[PDB]
Amino acid sequence: AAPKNRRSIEVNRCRRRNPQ
Amino acid sequence: IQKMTRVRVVDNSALGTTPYHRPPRCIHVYNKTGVGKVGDRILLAIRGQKKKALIVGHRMPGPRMTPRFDSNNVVLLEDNGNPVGTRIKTPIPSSLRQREGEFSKVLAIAQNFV
Amino acid sequence: KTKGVLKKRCRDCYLVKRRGRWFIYCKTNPKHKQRQ
Amino acid sequence: VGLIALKLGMMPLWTKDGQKHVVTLLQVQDCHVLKYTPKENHNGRMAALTVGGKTVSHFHKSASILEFYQELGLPPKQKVKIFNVTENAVIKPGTPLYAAHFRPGQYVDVTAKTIGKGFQGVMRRWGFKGQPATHGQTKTHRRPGAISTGDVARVWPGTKMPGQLGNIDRTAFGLKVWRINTKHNIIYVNGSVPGHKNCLVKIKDSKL
Amino acid sequence: NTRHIAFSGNKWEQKVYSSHTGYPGGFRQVTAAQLHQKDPVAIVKLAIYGMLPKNLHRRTMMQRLHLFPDEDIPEDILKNLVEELPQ
Amino acid sequence: TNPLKFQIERKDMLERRKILHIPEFYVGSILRVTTADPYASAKTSQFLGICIQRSGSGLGATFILRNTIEGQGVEICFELYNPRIQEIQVVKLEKRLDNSLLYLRDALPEYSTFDVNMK
RNA sequence: ACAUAAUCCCAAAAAA
RNA sequence: GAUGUUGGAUCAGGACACCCAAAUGGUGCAGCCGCUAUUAAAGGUUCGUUUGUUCAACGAUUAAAGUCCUACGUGAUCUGAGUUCAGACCGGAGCAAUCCAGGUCGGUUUCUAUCUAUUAUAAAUUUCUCCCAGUACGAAAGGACAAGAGAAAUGGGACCAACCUCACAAACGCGUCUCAGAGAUAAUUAAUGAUUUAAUCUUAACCUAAUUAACUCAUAAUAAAUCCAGCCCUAGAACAGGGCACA
Ligand SMILES: [Zn+2]
C-alpha cells in the first residue's frame, strides 16, 4: 500500500514522543 | 463408520460369499452424524443391490470400557429390522441386547459375545 | 377472508368494529367471516 | 452461599451403580470473613472471602494492603475476594470458615480464570473453517479471508478477528458436587473448571 | 415528578424510542409506556435533548438538568427559587 | 498439589488392595479377566488374552488386552481398579523388550522368533 | 410488501 | 491519465412475497395427514453423481433441504474453470489479406497498510424414541391433544482424569462435562357484566379469563491504585497478570 497524504508535524511529534 | 468405508458381511445366507467385481461400500448412515457406530443402521451398496445393515464391529472404540474389533463387520437386514440371513459369523458386542428385544434375534443367532 | 370491501353475504351476517378494524361474523356459516 | 477455593486436579470416581464420573478437586487452604458492607438499592449485602498463602506478605508491599491485614487482625493473605449475599438472615460478622460448608449432591457454579492462549489467530478462537490447503491456494490457509461488504465502508463493531485469548474470568454452570472432605479440606465437583491447577477458583450456589 | 407527566392522544403506546448499538441487528424499540414503567426520567430528558443546539453547550447545559420520578430533594435543604407554570 | 496427587494414588491403591487381591502384572503377560458387567444371563464373563499396553495413571490406571477369536482379532481395554472386574488369573508370564506390544499388530514370524527368544 | 439505524430537516405541538 | 464483467471457495449481513420449526382461521377439516389464508426472520435450511453452470436430471437423508438484495456481496483474501488479447485443427463464409457474438486443445494474475474501520461477557437452538394406547370415534380401514421419561444433533462457553496425536511435567478432539427460572407486550384468535341502538355486540367506557419469536431481569462475571530493584511463571509481542519470606 501507499500513503494517502504527507504527515503533519504535530502528528509526527505526538507519535514519536509520548507513547514511546 | 462413515461413507465410502468398506465393510465385511458376516451373513452366510444373505449377500452370498461369492464376491463381485466391486467390493461392498457404505453409502449413508441413518444417524444424523456421518460417523456411525455399533447399533446404528446404515445404507450400503453392493453390485446389483442396495441394502440396509446393522454395524456389529468397529476398529475405533470411543470409551475405554468397550472392546475393539480388527475389522468392520455388518449384518444385513430388512425394513422391519430383522436379519434376512439364516446364519451369522464372528463375535458380536453385548450392546445390541441393551438396545431392543426385537433386534435380539441377531443376538440369539450369534455364536459368541464380547 | 381478507379483502378491502366487507359486505354481508347473507341476512345472518353481523358487522362489528374492534381494535380499529372492521370484521364480519356469521354464526350460520364460518365461511362468511371477513377481515379488512 | 459460597466460598473461594484453589484448583487441585482431576480424577475419575466409581459410583455403586457402576457409572463412571469425571470430577475435579478443589482444595481449601484458609478462609476468613474480613469486611461486611451493607447496601440498599442492590437489596443485598457484600461479604469478604479470603484465601491466603501467607508467603506473599513480604514480597507484596502496599500501605493499604498491610494496614488492612494488621487493623483487621488478619494473618498475611495471598488472595482477597468478595461475595454477594442476598439473604440478610444468613449474614454473619467476621469469622473463619471450613470446607465443610458445602454438601454433596448440590449443584454449584465455578468462577475462575480461563487458560491464557496468548495471541491467537482467527482459528482456535471463533472456530472458523479457513481456506483449503491445496488447489492453488496461496498463503490463505489460516487466513480469515473477507470481512465486510462493499455497501458499508467501516467494519461492524464486535467483528471476529485474531487476538489475545484467555486469562479472563469465566463461570461454569451446572456442576454437581458428589462429595466433600472436611479434614483434608477437599471438594469433589463434577464438571470442568477454568484454568490450570493451583489457580484460584470460586465455588458458588448455582441457579436451578 | 417526571413520572406524573401526561402525554395526550394515543402516543403513549404509539411512541417508539430507538436505541441502536454497533452490532448488526442491534436496533431496539422501546415504547413510552414500558420506558415510563422502567426509566421515566429518561423520557423528559430526551425531550430536552433535542431542543438544545448541538456540540459542546448542549452537554454543558445538559449537566445543569436533573430529574426524579419521585420527590426527594436534599437540594431543597439548600434554598432555591420556585417557578410555577402549569399547562 | 503434586504430593497431594501422590496422596490420591496412595488412598486409591489402599482402597483397591484391601478389597481386591488381584496380583501385579506386566505388559506382555497372558491373563484371564472375569467380568460381571454385561447383561448376559451368565454373570461370569471370562476373557483370555495377552496385555499389549499398560500405562498406570492414578485411580484411572488401565491395561489393554488382545487375543485371537474365531479368526478375528479382539482387543478389550480394562481398568485395573475397576470394581466390575471379579478376578484376574495369570496363565503365563512374558517380558519381551518393551511395554509396547504394538509391533505385534503385524504378527510377523521373525518378531515371534524374538518373542520366543528372551525369558 | 424490500434488502445498514429511526422519523418524508431537531425536539415537540395543536386540530397579528 | 481503467469502476478488472461469469462461476466456485472464503466470510457474512439484511429484506419477507415463510420452505421448515411456532401461534391460528376456513376446509368438500371423522381421525391421521393435506389444501388455502393470517401472524412471525430467533435459529436452521444436508451430503453426492453428470456437465465450466445460471440450470437441469438422478442417488441417500432430513423438522426443511425457502427466495432475493448487498457493484446480479466478496480477486489491495484466493481460484482462472469460463472470457479479454500472441498458437494447432475440423466446419462455414471470403479470389485473397482473413474473419465468425459457432464448436475442440494450450496460454506468467503486480503490491511491505498512511488514514478511517476492526482485533468477543453470558442467559440458547433443533430432533428422534418410549410411556398413557392401540381407549374415545368408526361397518371396516384407520386413529390424537396434554402430561411424563430417555436419547442425540447443531451450537455457546470450556477442560485434559482415561482413550488418541504425543521423545520431558506442555496443546488439542477424535475424548469428557454443562447449558436454567421469570415478567410484559405480538398481529391473529377465544371470553365475562354491558352500553350508544329496550335486542345484539370481545369495546365504546370500565373491573377483569386466557394466546409464537423479539422486547426485558430475581440476577450471574466486575472494580482494595498510589512500593513492585532484582529473580522466576502452566503468564506473556512490549505492556499487563501471577509467584519469590530485600538491604
Ligand atoms: Zn352469513
Instruction: Tally the C-alpha atoms within 13 A of residue F108's C-alpha that lie toward its C-beta.
Output: 7
Q: What share of chain A is helix, strand, coil (3-state, %, to 5)?
A: 40, 0, 60
Could you tell me the maximum CA-CA distance found in chain E, to the nearest angstrom? 49
Dihedral (Cα; D69, D70, D76, D82), 10-degree rounding:
-10
How was this structure determined? It was done by cryo-EM
Please state whether strand H lies within 7 Å of residue D162 at its CB atom: yes
Q: Are D5 and D203 in contact (CB under 8 A)?
A: yes
Q: Are B98 and F39 in contact (CB under 8 A)?
A: yes
Nearest Cα to D202, choosing from D109, D102, D106, D126? D109
How many angstroms separate the Cα of B42 from the Cα of each of B30, B84, E53, F93? Answer: 6, 15, 73, 43
CA B96 to CA B77: how far, in whole Å?
A: 14
Distance D137 CA to H86 C1' (A): 28
Task: List bases in chain G with any atom under 7 Å of a protein Cβ.
Answer: 4-6, 10-15
The three cell numbers of residue D96 are: 473463619
CA F37 to CA D200: how far, in whole Å?
A: 40
CB contact under 8 Å between D9 and F84, yes or no, is no
Give the 3-state secondary structure of residue D169: strand
Dihedral (Cα; D55, D58, D59, D63), 10-degree rounding:
120
Could you tell me the maximum CA-CA distance found in chain D, to the nearest angstrom? 71
Element containing residue D187 per DSSP (H, E): strand D186-190
CA C36 to CA F104: how far, in whole Å?
A: 82
Q: Write down the residue that cell numbers 474470568 correspond to.
A: D169
Distance, CA of D126 to chain centre = 21
Q: Write down the residue that cell numbers 506473599 correspond to.
A: D56
- CB contact set of C2 (below 8 Å; sequence gap of 6+): C34, C35, C36
For residue D20, list its beta bridge partners.
D14
Give the 3-state secondary structure of residue A17: coil
Element containing residue E16 per DSSP (H, E): strand E16-20
- CB contact set of D31 (below 8 Å; sequence gap of 6+): D3, D4, D49, D50, D51, D96, D97, D98, D99
Give the 3-state secondary structure of residue E37: helix
Nearest Cα to D18, choosing from B65, E53, B32, F101? B65
The three cell numbers of residue D33 are: 470473613
Q: Are F72 and B69 in contact (CB under 8 A)?
A: yes
Specified resolution (Å): 4.9
* Residue E74 DSSP symbol: G
- Chain B interface mutation, best of F55, F74, F102, highest count of B Cβ atoms under 10 Å: F74
Closest residue in E to D154 (Cα) is E22
Q: Are B41 and B30 in contact (CB under 8 A)?
A: yes
Within 10 A of E37 (CB to CB), how many other CB atoms are there? 10
Dist. CA C10 → ligand 1 center (Å): 4
For residue B55, list its beta bridge partners.
B74
Q: Write down the residue that cell numbers 430383522 correspond to.
A: B82
Nearest protein residue to nucleotide H170 (CA to C1' distance) is D196
Cβ-based contacts of F82 with chain B (< 8 Å): 65
Nearest Cα to D200, choosing from D112, D116, D117, D115? D112
- D195: phi > 0 → left, psi -120 to 50 → alpha, else beta; which? left
Nearest Cα to B47, choosing from B13, B9, B88, B89? B9
CA E62 to CA E54: how far, in whole Å?
A: 11
DSSP per residue over D107-164, as a string?
Answer: EEEEEEEPPP-EEE-STTTS------SSTT--S-SS-----S-SSSSSPPTT----EE
Q: Which residues 1-36 in chain C have a CB closer than 7 A to strand H?
A: 1-2, 14, 16-21, 23, 29-31, 33, 35
Nearest CA-CA distance, residue B8 and chain F, Å = 12
Q: Are B62 and B70 in contact (CB under 8 A)?
A: no
CATH architecture of B1-114: Beta Barrel (2.40)
Domain ranges of chain B: 1-114
Buried-state track D90-122, b at ≥16 Cβ within 10 A, e below 16: eeeeeeeeebeebeeebbbbbbbbeeeeeeebb
- CB contact set of F57 (below 8 Å; sequence gap of 6+): none
CA D173 to CA D205: how far, in whole Å?
A: 10
CA F63 to CA F90: how far, in whole Å?
A: 14
> Which residues have their alpha-adjacent CB atom under 5 A from ion ligand 1?
C 9-10, 12-13, 26, 32
D158 backbone dihedrals φ, ψ, rounded to 5°: 95, 15
Dihedral (Cα; D178, D180, D186, D192), 10-degree rounding:
20
CA D3 to CA F112: how far, in whole Å?
A: 60
Buried-state track C7-16, b at ≥16 Cβ within 10 A, e below 16: eeeeeebeee
Cβ-based contacts of D197 with chain F (< 8 Å): 1
Q: Write down the residue that cell numbers 475462575 correspond to.
A: D112
CB pairs under 8 A between D and F: 23
What is the pairing mode between strands F62-69 and F72-79?
A: antiparallel
Nearest Cα to B103, choosing from B69, B54, B44? B54
Instruction: Label each residue of chain F as H, E or C.
Output: CHHHHHHHHHHHHHHHHHHCCCCCCCCCEEEEEEECCCCCCCCCEEEEEEEEEEECCCCCCEEEEEEEECCEEEEEEEECCCCCEEEEEEEEECCCCCCECHHHHCCCHHHHHHHHHCC
Within 10 A of A5 (CB to CB), how many other CB atoms are there? 5
D152 backbone dihedrals φ, ψ, rounded to 5°: -85, 120
Within 10 A of F30 (CB to CB), how many other CB atoms are there? 17
Buried-state track C19-30, b at ≥16 Cβ within 10 A, e below 16: eeeeebebeeee
The three cell numbers of residue D54 are: 501467607
CA C29 to CA C24: how far, in whole Å?
A: 11
Dihedral (Cα; E43, E44, E46, E48), 10-degree rounding:
170
**Is any Cβ of chain D less than 8 angstroms from the Cβ of E25?**
no
What angle (nearest 5°) sits at the alpha carbon of residue D154, between those of residues D149 and D158? Answer: 90
Dihedral (Cα; B93, B96, B98, B104), 10-degree rounding:
-120
For chain B, list the contacting chains (3+ Cβ pairs, <8 Å). F
Distance F32 CA to H59 C1' (A): 49
Distance D170 CA to H122 C1' (A): 9
The three cell numbers of residue B16 are: 452370498
CA C25 to CA C6: how far, in whole Å?
A: 11
Give the 3-state secondary structure of residue B14: coil
CB contact under 8 Å between B94 and F38, yes or no, is yes
Please state whether strand G lies within 7 Å of residue D208 at its CB atom: no
The three cell numbers of residue F47 are: 476373557
Within 10 A of D159 (CB to CB), how many other CB atoms are there? 13
Tell the burial category of D135 from Cβ atoms under 10 Å away from its Cβ (0-12, 13-18, 19+): exposed
What angle (nearest 5°) sits at the alpha carbon of residue F83, between those of residues F77 and F84? Answer: 60
Dist. CA C35 → ligand 1 center (Å): 14
Q: Are B72 and B37 in contact (CB under 8 A)?
A: no
CA D192 to CA D178: how far, in whole Å?
A: 14
CA B45 to CA B25: how far, in whole Å?
A: 5
CA D63 to CA D66: how far, in whole Å?
A: 6
The three cell numbers of residue F91 are: 496363565
Instruction: Tally the C-alpha atoms within 13 A of residue C25's C-alpha that lie toward its C-beta.
Output: 6
Nearest nt to the CA of E22 via C1' is: G5
Nearest CA-CA distance, residue D88 and chain E, Å = 26
CA D45 to CA D38: how far, in whole Å?
A: 5
Q: What share of chain D is helix, strand, coil (3-state, %, to 5)?
A: 5, 40, 55
Within 10 A of D183 (CB to CB), how many other CB atoms are there? 8
Give the 3-state secondary structure of residue D1: coil
Dist. CA B90 → ligand 1 center (Å): 74
How many angstroms separate the Cα of B103 from the Cα of each of B74, B79, D201, F10, F109? Answer: 14, 12, 49, 46, 42
Nearest Cα to B55, choosing from B43, B71, B38? B38
Dist. CA C13 → ligand 1 center (Å): 4
